[PDB]
Design a protein around this ligand. Structure first.
Ligand SMILES: CC(=O)N1CCN(c2ccccn2)CC1
Length: 121
């Protein structure tokens, strides 16, 4: 139907917007601390601590599969990256501090993304 095509066009455009958001968020992680899943070879107990691991590569996979139906689902995954890190790593670590900086700087990008999604529809 035409309605399905229109829906698919909107999702493709949402995906385009979120791709831009993801690139911007990732730029705020210059150390690439969050670029890839935490290695279970290097951190074998990681899943005892963190029940829902997340990272930017995994988000990008879902993104290109058009697996984010709305901005909320995308934000949930971004929050997992930060919140997982701030639990697994102690406050006085480069990892915890990277997550805080990513959270703070990312908030700006996400704030404008929410306005754009609402506005464009
Ligand atoms: C981002 C994050 O939470 N990580 C968990 C702690 N960590 C490592 C790396 C090697 C060995 C032990 N831990 C870095 C990744």
């Amino acid at each position: 139907s035409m309605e399905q095509v229109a829906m698919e066009l909107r999702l493709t455009e949402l995906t385009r917007l979120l791709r831009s958001v993801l690139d911007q968020l990732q730029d705020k992680d210059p150390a690439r601390i969050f670029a890839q899943p935490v290695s279970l070879k290097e951190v074998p107990d990681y899943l005892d601590h963190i029940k829902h691991p997340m990272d930017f590569a995994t988000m990008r996979k879902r993104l290109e599969a058009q697996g984010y139906k709305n901005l909320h689902e995308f934000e949930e995954d971004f929050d997992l990256i930060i919140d997982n890190c701030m639990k697994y790593n102690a406050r006085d670590t480069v990892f915890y501090r990277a997550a805080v900086r990513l959270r703070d700087q990312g908030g700006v990008v996400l704030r404008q993304a929410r306005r754009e999604v609402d506005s464009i529809g």
